[PDB]
Amino acid sequence: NIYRDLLQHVRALRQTITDFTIQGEGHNGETSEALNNILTDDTFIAPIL
Amino acid sequence: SFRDCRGTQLGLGRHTMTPATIKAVKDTFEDRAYPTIFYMLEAVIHGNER
């Protein structure tokens, strides 16, 4: 339940990022979430890999 | 907000779910590790009484 709650909170944060952007506006192969936010930007990487 | 206020107006004295059932159903709808055995059994049984 604790692990599922942490994962659900992460997915709720992702849906909140998705909510506060406007879709359908993609310039030069970058989607709208990657052009608005950073945690949805594919150029930025995790601190550890 | 108007639709939710109208729904509050409709469900004034009607039957409401106790929070135990709300918590259990919300837990089972947000359970990503739901076993596929239930899906296969519901597919084969396919709503036949016998």
Side-chain angles (χ1 to χ4, degrees), chain A residues 1 5 8-9, chain B residues 17-34:
Chain A
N1 279 6
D5 175 61
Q8 272 170 60
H9 196 249
Chain B
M17 314 192 180
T18 164
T21 71
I22 284 175
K23 193 253 289 181
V25 170
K26 188 191 67 173
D27 264 1
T28 199
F29 267 97
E30 273 153 39
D31 184 328
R32 311 270 165 157
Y34 196 70

Side-chain angles (χ1 to χ4, degrees), chain A residues 17 33 37-41 44:
Chain A
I17 275 176
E33 304 112 10
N37 208 288
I38 283 179
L39 310 179
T40 47
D41 204 334
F44 212 48

Side-chain angles (χ1 to χ4, degrees), chain A residues 3 5-17 39:
Chain A
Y3 289 113
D5 175 61
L6 267 174
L7 196 52
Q8 272 170 60
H9 196 249
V10 169
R11 282 173 171 163
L13 293 159
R14 202 261 170 278
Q15 273 164 20
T16 279
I17 275 176
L39 310 179

